[PDB]
Amino acid sequence: MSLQHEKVTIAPLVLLSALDHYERTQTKENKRCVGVILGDANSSTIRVTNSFALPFEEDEKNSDVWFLDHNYIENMNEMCKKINAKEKLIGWYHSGPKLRASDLKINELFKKYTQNNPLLLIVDVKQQGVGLPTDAYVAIEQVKDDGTSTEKTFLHLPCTIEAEEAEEIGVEHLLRDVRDQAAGGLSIRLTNQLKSLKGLQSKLKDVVEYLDKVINKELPINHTILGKLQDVFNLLPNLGTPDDDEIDVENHDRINISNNLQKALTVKTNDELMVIYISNLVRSIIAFDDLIENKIQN
Amino acid sequence: IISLTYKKISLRDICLKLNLDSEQTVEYMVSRAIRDGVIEAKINHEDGFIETTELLNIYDSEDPQ
Numbered sequence A: 001m002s003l004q005h006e007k008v009t010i011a012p013l014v015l016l017s018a019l020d021h022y023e024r025t026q027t028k029e030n031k032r033c034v035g036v037i038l039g040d041a042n043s044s045t046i047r048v049t050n051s052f053a054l055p056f057e058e059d060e061k062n063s064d065v066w067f068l069d070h071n072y073i074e075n076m077n078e079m080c081k082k083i084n085a086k087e088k089l090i091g092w093y094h095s096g097p098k099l100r101a102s103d104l105k106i107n108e109l110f111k112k113y114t115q116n117n118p119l120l121l122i123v124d125v126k127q128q129g130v131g132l133p134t135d136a137y138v139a140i141e142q143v144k145d146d147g148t149s150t151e152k153t154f155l156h157l158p159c160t161i162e163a164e165e166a167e168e169i170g171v172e173h174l175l176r177d178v179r180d181q182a183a184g185g186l187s188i189r190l191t192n193q194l195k196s197l198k199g200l201q202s203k204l205k206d207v208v209e210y211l212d213k214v215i216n217k218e219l220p221i222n223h224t225i226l227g228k229l230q231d232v233f234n235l236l237p238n239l240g241t242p243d244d245d246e247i248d249v250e251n252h253d254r255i256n257i258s259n260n261l262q263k264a265l266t267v268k269t270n271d272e273l274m275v276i277y278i279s280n281l282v283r284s285i286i287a288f289d290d291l292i293e294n295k296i297q298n
Numbered sequence B: 001i002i003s004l005t006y007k008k009i010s011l012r013d014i015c016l017k018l019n020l021d022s023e024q025t026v027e028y029m030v031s032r033a034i035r036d037g038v039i040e041a042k043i044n045h046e047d048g049f050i051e052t053t054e055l056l057n058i059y060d061s062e063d064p065q
Helices: A012-024 A070-083 A103-113 A165-174 A186-214 A223-234 A242-297 B011-017 B023-036
Strands: A007-010 A034-040 A045-053 A088-094 A119-123 A134-142 A151-157 A159-161 B008-010 B041-044 B049-052
Touching: A007 A012, A007 A119, A007 A134, A012 A034, A012 A045, A012 A119, A012 A165, A034 A070, A045 A088, A045 A119, A070 A103, A088 A103, A103 A134, A103 A151, A134 A159, B008 B011, B011 B023, B011 B049, B023 B041
Parallel strands: A007 A045, A007 A159, A088 A119
Antiparallel strands: A034 A045, A034 A088, A119 A134, A134 A151, B008 B049, B041 B049
């Protein structure tokens, strides 16, 4: 259906709902909770506004065996539209941990109800790391050059977060932290430069051990991954370019302004140097007279 | 003074200028002086003259930093 799924912006309310509902439907230990996600589409940017739980019973043994009460979904839906009839069914949340190729079948069910391709928004509830606990995937059927007679598949989609005005003010009222994703003062940003290096390193390391497995442990040759790595090597920086010379001109500019400004603060504080010393001279006389006053008092 | 005024000067001309005795003598003053970088020159024996070498544009260089 809708091909339009270029970006996914996600309401923090959705997250919050997915985390809470997980426990009040009382599912634990890899027992999946599937619920509906409501919001707008037929739009480039997809905006997931809100969500609601459905009952979901999943058989322990296999992921091909499961119970879902279809009829419930239609009954819930019509009351919900009365509240807000903008919202439409656009797909389903899956309560993590992590993608399955059994989902492909699951997705298809939801497609009956929906007039757009259902979005599979894996809201991971385990919150591993401080990085976003959303991967988004959409079921797409595409042809592939290998020989495969049409493959059916889940393609990763960029996940970001946006909140409404009403929503945003709720986020800030709740929080009481000092914060450090502020990237504000010299201190936060000092950290932030180091943090980014190591951020990169961890990712880079994962790429590196993954490449070993491809040509040694018979993980498939996924041509897409390799294909993408070429742009990284081609658009890698170079030295002895007249760009490098250009950076040096800029470097001189910024250090230059730094020194004029450094001297300029020295002047301001020194004016204060004088002001504290006037005060101090004055108070020598006051201290002297103070004694004479006390003599009378005694 | 001689290096600044005249960039390329035959070694003959310096001798007359500073009243110094012979060609070999001026050889020896410049040679000791450029070790200390006062003059900041290099003698070109072959051509029979002396070349100033300080020629500015040290901006481009890492030097102002």
